[PDB]
Amino acid sequence: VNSFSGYLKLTDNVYIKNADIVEEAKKVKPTVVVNAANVYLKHGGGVAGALNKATNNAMQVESDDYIATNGPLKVGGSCVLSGHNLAKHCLHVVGPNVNKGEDIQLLKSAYENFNQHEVLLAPLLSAGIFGADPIHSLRVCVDTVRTNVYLAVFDKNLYDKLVSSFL
Numbered sequence: 692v693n694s695f696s697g698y699l700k701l702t703d704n705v706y707i708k709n710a711d712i713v714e715e716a717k718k719v720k721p722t723v724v725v726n727a728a729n730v731y732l733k734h735g736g737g738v739a740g741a742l743n744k745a746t747n748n749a750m751q752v753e754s755d756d757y758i759a760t761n762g763p764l765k766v767g768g769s770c771v772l773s774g775h776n777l778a779k780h781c782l783h784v785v786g787p788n789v790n791k792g793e794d795i796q797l798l799k800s801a802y803e804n805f806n807q808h809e810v811l812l813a814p815l816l817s818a819g820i821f822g823a824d825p826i827h828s829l830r831v832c833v834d835t836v837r838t839n840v841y842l843a844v845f846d847k848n849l850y851d852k853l854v855s856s857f858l
């Protein structure tokens with residue numbers, strides 16, 4: 692049993708909800724929250740900007756030190772950093788950004804990072820400001836992630852379309 696409430700069960704291991712991820716993290720304090728990161732961990736907008744704002748910029752300060760030591764992530768890669776006031780840990784995952792011309796085949800590699808964690812709260816990788824089709828992102832998630840993933844979908848309209856169209 693876990694703390695996640697109000698999710699629709701899609702598969703054995705994937706759950707979905709219309710909830711504010713920044714509000715969901717604050718309520719649940721999950722072991723892992725996933726960030727929709729870029730390779731520079733520049734948390735300027737979208738999930739990264741909203742999560743970072745909710746940490747009062749402490750996520751960005753920690754991320755800048757990580758990049759200064761390690762250099763940029765790979766597209767499809769990840770790193771584990773603090774979850775600050777939102778979670779124990781934040782798994783920063785870089786999905787491909789279609790609005791930068793990145794290979795959508797890297798979305799499966801991105802989701803494979805989730806398999807290193809038994810339970811996660813996550814957004815749909817590469818969706819909205821990352822420019823991929825969220826229906827495709829949900830299909831790759833279901834077909835790639837084997838651990839227990841609780842997906843927070845921002846747009847009530849998109850949530851309903853994801854559920855209605857789910858095979």
Ligand SMILES: Nc1cnccc1C(=O)O
Nearest residue numbers: 712738814819843844845
């Ligand atoms: N699920 C979310 C929650 N908050 C902000 C953005 C999103 C998003 O997926 O864009």
